[PDB]
Amino acid sequence: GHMATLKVIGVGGGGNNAVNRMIDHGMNNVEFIAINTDGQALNLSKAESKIQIGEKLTRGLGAGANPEIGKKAAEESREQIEDAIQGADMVFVTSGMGGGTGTGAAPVVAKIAKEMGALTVGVVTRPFSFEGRKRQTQAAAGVEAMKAAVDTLIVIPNDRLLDIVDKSTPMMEAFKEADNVLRQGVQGISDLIAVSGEVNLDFADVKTIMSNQGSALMGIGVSSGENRAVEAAKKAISSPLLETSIVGAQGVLMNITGGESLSLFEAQEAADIVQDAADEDVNMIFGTVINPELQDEIVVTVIATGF
Numbered sequence: 631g632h633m634a635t636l637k638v639i640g641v642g643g644g645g646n647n648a649v650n651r652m653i654d655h656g657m658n659n660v661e662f663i664a665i666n667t668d669g670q671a672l673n674l675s676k677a678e679s680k681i682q683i684g685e686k687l688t689r690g691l692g693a694g695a696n697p698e699i700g701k702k703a704a705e706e707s708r709e710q711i712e713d714a715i716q717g718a719d720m721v722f723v724t725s726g727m728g729g730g731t732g733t734g735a736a737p738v739v740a741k742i743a744k745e746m747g748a749l750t751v752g753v754v755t756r757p758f759s760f761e762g763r764k765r766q767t768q769a770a771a772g773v774e775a776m777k778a779a780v781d782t783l784i785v786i787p788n789d790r791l792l793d794i795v796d797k798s799t800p801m802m803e804a805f806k807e808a809d810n811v812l813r814q815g816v817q818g819i820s821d822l823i824a825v826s827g828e829v830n831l832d833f834a835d836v837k838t839i840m841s842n843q844g845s846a847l848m849g850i851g852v853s854s855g856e857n858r859a860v861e862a863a864k865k866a867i868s869s870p871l872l873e874t875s876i877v878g879a880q881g882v883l884m885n886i887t888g889g890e891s892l893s894l895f896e897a898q899e900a901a902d903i904v905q906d907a908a909d910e911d912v913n914m915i916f917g918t919v920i921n922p923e924l925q926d927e928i929v930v931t932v933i934a935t936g937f
C-alpha cells in the first residue's frame with residue numbers, strides 16, 4: 631500500500647492562476663501540474679510540473695477562444711498528460727470554462743485521469759454574464775463535457791462573485807475567494823488521509839462518496855463558543871459561490887474535528903444541521919477526530935453528493 635497521492639491540475643489561464651495562488655498559499659503533500667497552450671503564461675507558473683499542450687497547433691499562443699483548439703491540443707499531448715498524472719490516486723482538475731484552452735482541454739485531462747484509475751474531481755468556473763452569450767454557451771458545453779468525464783463536479787458561476795464583493799473589492803481578492811472552494815476541499819481530504827480519527831474516515835470513504843456521482847459540494851466550517859457545532863456545520867454547507875447547494879444531497883461524508891471537549895450531543899447537532907438542510911434522508915459517512923491541540927474550536931468538513 632501507500633499514502634493516497636493527490637494532484638491538482640490547472641488547465642488554461644484561470645486554472646493555472648488558481649494553481650499559482652494555491653502554491654503561494656502554502657499547500658503541501660499535493661502535486662501541482664500546470665497545463666496550458668500559452669507558453670508565456672506557463673513560463674510564469676510556480677508548478678513543479680508544466681505541460682505545454684498544442685505546441686504544433688498554437689506555437690506557444692493560447693487557443694484564442696476556440697474550444698476545439700483546446701481539445702485538439704490536449705489530444706495532441708495525451709502522452710505527456712498521462713505521464714504527469716501517473717501515480718495519482720486522486721486528481722483535481724481546475725479550469726475556467728468559456729475560453730479556448732480550458733473549455734476544450736480540461737475535459738480531456740479529466741478523461742485521461744479517470745481512465746488511468748484516479749478518482750477525478752473537477753472544479754470549474756462559468757463566465758460572468760458581462761462576458762456575453764457566446765462565452766456562456768461555450769462554457770455550458772464545456773461544463774457538460776466535464777460532467778461526462780469526471781467522477782464529481784463542482785461549478786462556481788463567476789456571477790456569484792458579484793454577490794460577495796462591494797463596489798471597491800479588488801478583482802484579485804474576489805478571485806481568491808473562489809480559490810477557497812478547491813483549496814479547502816483538497817486540504818480536507820489531505821487531513822482525512824493523514825490522521826487516524828477516533829471514528830475514522832479514509833481515502834476509501836472518499837472514493838465511496840465521490841465515485842461516479844455527478845454534482846458535488848465540498849465545504850468546511852470552523853467555529854468556537856456557545857453554538858459552535860451548529861455554526862460550524864452551517865458554515866460548511868454555506869454555498870454563496872456554488873451552483874450546487876446542499877439541497878437534495880442524498881449522500882454525505884461528514885467529519886468533525888475538535889478538542890477533548892467535543893460532545894456527543896454536539897456531533898448529533900451538526901449531523902442534524904446537514905440532514906435538515908439537504909431536506910432528504912441522507913446516507914451519512916460520519917467521522918470524528920480529537921485533536922487536543924485544539925481548545926474551544928470545532929471544525930466540520932462536508933462532502934455531499936447523490937443529487
Ligand SMILES: Nc1nc2c(ncn2[C@@H]2O[C@H](COP(=O)(O)OP(=O)(O)O)[C@@H](O)[C@H]2O)c(=O)[nH]1
Nearest residue numbers: 642643644647726728729730731732757805808
Ligand atoms: N474566478 C476566476 N475566473 C477566471 C480566472 N481567469 C479566467 N477566469 C474565467 O475563465 C474564463 C476563461 O479564461 P481563461 O482560463 O484565461 O481561458 P483559456 O486559457 O483560453 O482556457 C474567462 O472567461 C473567465 O470567466 C480566475 O483567475 N478566476
Ligand SMILES: [Ca+2]
Nearest residue numbers: 822825827831
Ligand atoms: Ca482518517
